[PDB]
Design a binder for these strands. Sequence first.
RNA 1: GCCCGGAUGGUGGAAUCGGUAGACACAAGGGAUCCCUCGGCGCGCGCUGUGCGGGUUCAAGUCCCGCUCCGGGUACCA
Length: 860
Amino acid sequence: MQEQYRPEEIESKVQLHWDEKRTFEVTEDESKEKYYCLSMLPYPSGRLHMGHVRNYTIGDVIARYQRMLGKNVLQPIGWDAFGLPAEGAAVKNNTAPAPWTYDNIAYMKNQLKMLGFGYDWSRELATCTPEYYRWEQKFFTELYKKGLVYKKTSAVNWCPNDQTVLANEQVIDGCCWRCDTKVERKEIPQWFIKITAYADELLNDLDKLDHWPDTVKTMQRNWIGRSEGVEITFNVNDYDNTLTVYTTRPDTFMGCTYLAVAAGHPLAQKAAENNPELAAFIDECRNTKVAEAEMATMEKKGVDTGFKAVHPLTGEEIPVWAANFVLMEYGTGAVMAVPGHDQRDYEFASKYGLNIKPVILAADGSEPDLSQQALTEKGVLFNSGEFNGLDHEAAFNAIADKLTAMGVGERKVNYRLRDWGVSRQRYWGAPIPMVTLEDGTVMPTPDDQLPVILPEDVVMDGITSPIKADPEWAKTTVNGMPALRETDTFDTFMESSWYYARYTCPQYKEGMLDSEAANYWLPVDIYIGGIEHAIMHLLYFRFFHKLMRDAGMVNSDEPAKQLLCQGMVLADAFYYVGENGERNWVSPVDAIVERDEKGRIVKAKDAAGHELVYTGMSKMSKSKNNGIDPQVMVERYGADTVRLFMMFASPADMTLEWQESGVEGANRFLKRVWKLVYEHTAKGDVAALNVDALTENQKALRRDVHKTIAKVTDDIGRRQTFNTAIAAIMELMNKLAKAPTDGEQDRALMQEALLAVVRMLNPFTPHICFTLWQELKGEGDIDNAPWPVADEKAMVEDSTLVVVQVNGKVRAKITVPVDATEEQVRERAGQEHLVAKYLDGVTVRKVIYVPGKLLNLVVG
RNA sequence: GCCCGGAUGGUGGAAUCGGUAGACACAAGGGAUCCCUCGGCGCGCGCUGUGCGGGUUCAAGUCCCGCUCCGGGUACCA
Ligand SMILES: CC(C)C[C@H](N)C(=O)NS(=O)(=O)OC[C@H]1O[C@@H](n2cnc3c(N)ncnc32)[C@H](O)[C@@H]1O
Ligand SMILES: [Mg+2]
Ligand SMILES: [Zn+2]
């Protein structure tokens, strides 16, 4: 043990030891109690940034802690390797997506090894290899056989010249991000998984996930959006087809004053033939973007169809309009408007002078005031013929029933959740195992032909995908005839939905999952990833686990017992617009900034001389180039400093705006820990401790040690407030540095304390603690050392602190034997001259005593 | 727009079930890796102070009603 702490002479040594003894490689040991601690797997984007560091440090803190409690901990790592970025990056780099990705993986792997996360590298997976995606192919063909898969027309973003489909990240400020041509809606048939067949189960089972946070549970209920209502069918005067709408407010029906139909609805197309105002508005509607966001800010717009639908309870002709907020693709392409009682309908009717009819009374039973806005609150009905007078429940049921009677309405459960579109028309993904025969029939790729392998050795022109460009690739023979395979590939969420199960058995060749293995490990005891994955990934992940359950491959109902969503690590983001309108994101450390009197950024240049557009803080990521790589710091300070500082910044679940200021604190603290063990072990082996011979100064200090163990255990294991854990450990280190380490008792006691501190820091700063555990001569490798237990008999307190308030203002603090009555505390409180000062002239009207904590004398 | 979160000294944050505001740290200043000062306004004291406005309570960073700004997601970024 060198006096000075040189992490560079330590971290790599300890890292080689973990690779040689395979410390973190585990099996299905049934003699041990398992713990599966899983962190959401990285997309191999290029480099790690502090967002990954945060996520993976949290997971490793939990993994090592659980291992010290004596459990068999899987903590696996892999690469969620398909996706969009590799395509653009390939072109920009005169490469192909496959090798760019494998190098990215080689690199990030090395970065992860150098932060010393105790992964089971024997179970590493890469989702872009056929050894992986073959099973999702097979699986998807089983889903099609069970009737959970179908094809429908779906709106996509489409640069009409390049004739290529764009993701929404790629459409910008109107136009595309390549060139000056405007994106367009295009309806393209695509493959869908009926996640809506599992909607109720997904909704209901949220009430069983008592160790998931409510943020995520609510976000998911509201996303599923279950609803009971009615579907009403209308006839239309000079049109031989019916219209169907769905409403949750059948009670407001008699106030339906118009219908809206989608730009692409057949009726609007028929009408647009003879109406050039309508036709121009429909052609206008192709530029409506595919995205709830921009779809809901847009000005609401419409044209009258000229057609007139018959209200089936009043027999009153009501106009049908075409409107830019009703989409053929989601629902029946028609809605009914009740402007008196739906705010969006009010605003449309206000704009285009449509009749706004009130049919629901206010809470006190007079007619509502509709001059400024729709009345949305449920109420008694008037203006509603035979339904007048009924309350909300009643009117719902009578209108529903009348409507059923007539045979034009029906009750219906309905969800905001839509089925899951898994077709992409991009190269870099798992191919979808369907086939079209010469016939024209469609079926699954048969089993003798799985996996359908994506070729890796390609040249990419940007424009097309090479599996569509070469028409020989799609050629095959099925049922003894020429057949063509599908050249669309899977949504890369498909691979991130079952990886947690494959990590249990990654080299099993006989099928998707070794169920013995999978059931030993599952369910995941803790799942750690970003709050960004609240809905999408986490819904598909649960949906998929259920589908595997229904296939009989896993016993659990839910995949993950506890979920821990970390906050996002944020960074400023900047760009300049290039020569042909390409956005060029610049990194914060290249950006020269002049700043507000309040701290907000006012101007910004790069070194080369470009006015940057400042976009604010946002998640670190390669997309916007605002990632800070940890690699520089690790080589300056050590992995243990970077790790400690991340966990000390802020609590795991809070979103953190990254800053560099603060690392020295972490580095200096580690030098003090090092210096303390060094000075203590340099002096030799220690006497056995004599618990009950201690000075009172020693009893006090042994109490703070044991109280720290209790708090840190709770902070890591139950609260996951790592910052407070670390803070409690610093406090203690501060007292330990002031304790004289001189007689044998002091030295025995410092040994206990230090053995405990070192073990407690271990999950956070394992390289330094592995080393220090050897200088203190602890048993074996710290990686398997037992986690420390607080001795209750050391933590007994004799006295406690009471705050004395007077009308709620603190006037003193007093120590008072724990065993103290209210009468005792008043008296003592009375002795304080500053309390006395505020009791003269006045009377004690009331007294509040919170046992052992606070006295408040309420005073006139 | 809609759904979910957030805001505390120059800075990151602490206060775990409504009960001491600023633990533990970074920066800064002064002194010899160690000390010491460190919310604001005016001394071994008083007032005030948790984004803004009201409210409940003996007591509010915490709870109630109404807002601003910031971030996450919004179904083809992952
Ligand atoms: C399980 C699948 C859907 C995860 C996906 N491959 C993914 O999110 N990959 S990732 O972006 O490389 O992230 C890996 C994990 O780190 C979290 N994370 C990313 N970016 C982050 C920022 N900027 N701050 C905090 N956390 C970030 C992400 O949520 C993943 O959990
Ligand atoms: Mg602030
Ligand atoms: Zn284009």
